[PDB]
Amino acid sequence: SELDQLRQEAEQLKNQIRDARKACADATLSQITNNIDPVGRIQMRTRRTLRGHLAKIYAMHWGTDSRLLVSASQDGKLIIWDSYTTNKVHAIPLRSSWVMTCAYAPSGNYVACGGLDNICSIYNLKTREGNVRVSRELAGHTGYLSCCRFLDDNQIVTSSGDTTCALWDIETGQQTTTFTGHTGDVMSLSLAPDTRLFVSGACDASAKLWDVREGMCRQTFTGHESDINAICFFPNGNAFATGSDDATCRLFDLRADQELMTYSHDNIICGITSVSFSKSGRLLLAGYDDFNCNVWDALKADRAGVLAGHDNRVSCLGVTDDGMAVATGSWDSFLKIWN
Amino acid sequence: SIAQARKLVEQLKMEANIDRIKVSKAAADLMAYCEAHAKEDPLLTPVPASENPFREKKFF
Amino acid sequence: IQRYVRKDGKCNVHHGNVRETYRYLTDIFTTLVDLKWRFNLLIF
Amino acid sequence: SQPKKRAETLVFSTHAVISMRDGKLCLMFRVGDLRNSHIVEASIRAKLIKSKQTSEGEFIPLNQTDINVGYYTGDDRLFLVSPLIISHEINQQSPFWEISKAQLPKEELEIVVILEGMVEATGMTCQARSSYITSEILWGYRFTPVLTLEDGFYEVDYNSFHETYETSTPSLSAKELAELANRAESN
Amino acid sequence: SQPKKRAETLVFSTHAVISMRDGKLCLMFRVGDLRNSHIVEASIRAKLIKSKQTSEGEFIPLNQTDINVGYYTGDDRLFLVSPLIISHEINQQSPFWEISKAQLPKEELEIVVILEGMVEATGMTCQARSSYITSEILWGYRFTPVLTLEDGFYEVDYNSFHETYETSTPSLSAKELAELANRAESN
Numbered sequence: 001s002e003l004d005q006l007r008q009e010a011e012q013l014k015n016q017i018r019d020a021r022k023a024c025a026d027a028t029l030s031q032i033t034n035n036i037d038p039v040g041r042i043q044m045r046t047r048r049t050l051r052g053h054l055a056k057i058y059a060m061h062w063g064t065d066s067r068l069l070v071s072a073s074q075d076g077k078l079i080i081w082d083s084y085t086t087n088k089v090h091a092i093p094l095r096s097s098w099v100m101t102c103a104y105a106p107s108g109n110y111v112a113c114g115g116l117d118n119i120c121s122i123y124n125l126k127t128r129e130g131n132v133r134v135s136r137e138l139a140g141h142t143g144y145l146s147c148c149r150f151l152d153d154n155q156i157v158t159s160s161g162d163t164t165c166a167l168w169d170i171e172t173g174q175q176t177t178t179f180t181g182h183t184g185d186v187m188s189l190s191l192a193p194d195t196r197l198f199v200s201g202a203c204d205a206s207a208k209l210w211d212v213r214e215g216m217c218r219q220t221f222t223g224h225e226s227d228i229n230a231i232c233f234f235p236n237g238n239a240f241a242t243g244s245d246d247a248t249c250r251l252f253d254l255r256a257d258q259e260l261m262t263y264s265h266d267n268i269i270c271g272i273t274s275v276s277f278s279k280s281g282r283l284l285l286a287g288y289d290d291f292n293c294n295v296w297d298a299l300k301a302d303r304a305g306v307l308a309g310h311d312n313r314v315s316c317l318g319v320t321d322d323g324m325a326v327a328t329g330s331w332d333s334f335l336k337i338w339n
Numbered sequence: 340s341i342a343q344a345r346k347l348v349e350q351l352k353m354e355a356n357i358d359r360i361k362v363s364k365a366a367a368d369l370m371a372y373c374e375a376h377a378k379e380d381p382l383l384t385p386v387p388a389s390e391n392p393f394r395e396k397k398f399f
Numbered sequence: 400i401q402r403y404v405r406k407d408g409k410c411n412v413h414h415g416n417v418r419e420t421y422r423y424l425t426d427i428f429t430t431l432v433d434l435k436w437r438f439n440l441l442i443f
Numbered sequence: 444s445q446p447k448k449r450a451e452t453l454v455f456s457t458h459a460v461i462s463m464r465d466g467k468l469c470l471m472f473r474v475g476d477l478r479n480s481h482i483v484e485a486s487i488r489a490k491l492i493k494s495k496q497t498s499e500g501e502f503i504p505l506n507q508t509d510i511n512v513g514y515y516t517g518d519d520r521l522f523l524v525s526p527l528i529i530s531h532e533i534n535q536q537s538p539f540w541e542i543s544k545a546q547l548p549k550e551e552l553e554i555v556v557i558l559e560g561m562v563e564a565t566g567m568t569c570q571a572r573s574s575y576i577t578s579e580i581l582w583g584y585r586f587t588p589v590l591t592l593e594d595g596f597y598e599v600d601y602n603s604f605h606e607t608y609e610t611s612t613p614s615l616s617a618k619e620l621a622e623l624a625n626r627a628e629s630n
Numbered sequence: 631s632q633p634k635k636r637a638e639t640l641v642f643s644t645h646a647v648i649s650m651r652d653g654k655l656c657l658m659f660r661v662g663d664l665r666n667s668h669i670v671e672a673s674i675r676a677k678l679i680k681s682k683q684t685s686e687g688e689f690i691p692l693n694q695t696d697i698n699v700g701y702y703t704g705d706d707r708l709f710l711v712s713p714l715i716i717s718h719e720i721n722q723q724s725p726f727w728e729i730s731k732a733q734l735p736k737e738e739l740e741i742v743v744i745l746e747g748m749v750e751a752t753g754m755t756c757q758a759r760s761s762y763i764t765s766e767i768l769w770g771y772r773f774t775p776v777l778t779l780e781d782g783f784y785e786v787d788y789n790s791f792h793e794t795y796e797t798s799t800p801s802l803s804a805k806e807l808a809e810l811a812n813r814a815e816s817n
């Protein structure tokens with residue numbers, strides 16, 4: 001008996017949430033946008049090719065200054081590039097090659113990385129005596145570090161294959177808050193621009209919204225039929241896009257608490273590795289396993305163009321804060337800048 | 340099972356009791372934001388070389 | 400694609416940040432004969 | 444007088460080819476010497492260059508593993524007058540053991556080939572080098588003959604030195620050929 | 631013109647390191663060549679120097695036992711452009727077979743490392759030497775990468791040539807690792 005009440009209670013609770021969403025569902029984003037002029041021909045060209053990494057790149061991150069960026073590769077290096085000159089500002093050697101994520105701090109003072117080592121190493125880029133040495137090793141997780149993003153020089157969030165995310169205090173090396181909830185490995189997270197909340201895509205085929213201050217899960221978004229490897233906030237912070245093994249990108253609204261759109265096309269069977277919005281949020285840029293980055297009209301739901309320059313998988317994307325350029329990282333060990 | 344069911348039930352209760360907005364508003368809002376900042380997005384508009392930093396031609 | 404060695408035999412490697420450059424002067428004979436002809440004939 | 448200069452009259456074939464030889468799958472490249480004079484104490488060695496990662500985590504940039512080309516029989520010591528086809532038998536111990544025709548182009552590797560011997564006149568040792576990147580390794584091909592007989596002398600035709608032609612050749616890795624043989628002998 | 635002078639532009643790493651590589655415990659030192667020109671017929675050999683006493687009574691002052699660094703595969707014959715990490719696999723036949731992290735510093739030994747090849751321009755053979763005494767052998771360490779890619783050329787960063795970093799590494803002797811493996815495979 002006792003187990004039935006609870007199982008049945010769980011099911012009815014979904015319906016309310018189910019119907020409540022359907023109550024809000026009075027129109028489709030496509031129908032509303034049917035008025036707008038389509039985006040036109042989006043054909044960009046490679047303005048830079050960053051050459052240096054000796055093996056697959058797993059993630060890269062633009063700096064808030066829209067010029068410098070970090071990259072991480074199994075060659076064992078964090079390379080901090082000057083996208084303008086191509087000049088390598090820092091080449092940081094790692095203790096392990098199994099790196100999965102890197103993150104550039106907003107202030108340009110720090111940079112973080114971690115992976116199958118289960119540690120988030122924070123690297124000081126302006127050490128007392130002009131060197132690049134680890135300043136903290138954030139230990140606590142019981143699974144690979146899948147992603148991480150700085151809030152400020154003293155705080156950073158992380159996601160892990162141990163089905164949790166965490167809030168850390170760099171100053172003390174302690175884990176401030178544990179965001180449990182997911183029933184699968186957490187592959188990606190995304191920080192809201194006001195950093196008051198964040199979303200996280202996982203291998204339970206769901207994204208979750210988390211209150212940074214409260215340390216609680218607010219909403220859970222479903223729809224994807226497979227793992228989520230990339231998740232990304234819409235520039236206004238009230239909506240976000242996800243990329244999945246199920247060959248689709250999907251837009252979700254926070255306030256409406258549901259999916260608005262699905263971005264898919266036949267001839268696209270492979271997974272999505274990265275997603276990113278342009279400065280105004282009109283373009284959705286998705287990195288795919290077939291070596292391409294596809295550019296979508298985020299409102300209209302169709303392909304605006306495609307970036308073909310890489311010989312192996314596009315594993316990471318990034319649009320500058322000043323909206324001027326897009327970065328692509330690839331398993332062919334190159335990064336490229338598109339305009 | 341039991342301890343995880345109660346975990347779920349209690350989570351769903353909290354997701355149920357939240358304020359929601361109609362899609363039409365939510366949708367037109369995104370659309371609005373886009374049409375508002377359309378001017379600040381160089382990736383819709385093939386970038387004029389003067390304005391582009393990554394093209395080192397400039398005025399030439 | 401980048402290769403390590405060219406078909407003609409030359410090697411695509413540069414030796415950067417040689418802090419102790421005096422060593423090139425220590426075995427001067429090797430540096431001399433390793434030079435381009437213009438530079439031997441010049442020095443000569 | 445420096446010997447590296449001799450390398451100019453030592454040629455390597457433009458491609459390496461893979462084809463079957465007396466039941467063994469072999470990687471072959473051809474070498475030649477344009478002069479009537481000799482390369483004394485001639486010898487051929489070959490290194491496979493490709494990056495790798497240890498179980499423990501260590502990335503090794505351009506890892507050199509010696510390719511066998513006669514070491515245990517002294518058939519790596521060449522008597523090189525007319526062109527020679529150097530053969531690497533792709534056996535259990537080969538780095539091409541698990542590489543099929545299918546996989547080859549998707550491998551990121553490079554074979555460095557080194558010919559070292561003494562210029563006959565100056566006792567000095569020369570080192571001629573060349574490389575075969577993954578795209579220059581023709582699967583299912585054979586080198587075109589160059590040798591013909593003339594009155595009192597064997598004549599070489601260097602026009603044909605680099606030329607190859609296609610033959611019937613398995614798409615399977617050397618390893619998979621063994622698996623067919625294991626069931627064939629057990630049948 | 632004497633070749634020993636070349637040794638000046640041949641560097642040995644400042645330390646030897648011991649760490650795990652694909653399940654094997656290895657003693658590693660790194661070697662480099664500062665010039666664009668080559669060391670022809672390059673080869674690396676290594677000798678362990680420590681005194682000993684026979685069962686019968688004979689003391690042998692500074693007994694040299696060759697350390698294996700590629701002899702049976704010809705991987706001791708180097709193609710040395712960018713820096714190489716020479717690896718001695720510490721196996722049953724190794725003189726470090728019964729040496730644990732604990733015992734190392736209390737051993738009274740010295741590894742002599744010898745690089746011998748021909749200066750490219752003069753055919754003459756050079757011999758570069760160095761030594762690693764027991765205190766210069768870092769247990770549980772890895773060499774820091776030096777190679778990076780640039781447009782059309784691989785660039786070496788000699789600032790990092792001597793640099794090492796620590797990794798997770800057993801304190802046990804290679805022999806004791808085998809004993810764990812014997813029970814693991816038998817389990």
Ligand SMILES: [K+]
Pocket residue numbers: none
């Ligand atoms: K000899």
Ligand code: NA
Pocket residue numbers: 476477478479480481482523524525
């Ligand atoms: Na000849």
Ligand code: NA
Pocket residue numbers: 663664665666667668669710711712
């Ligand atoms: Na060299």
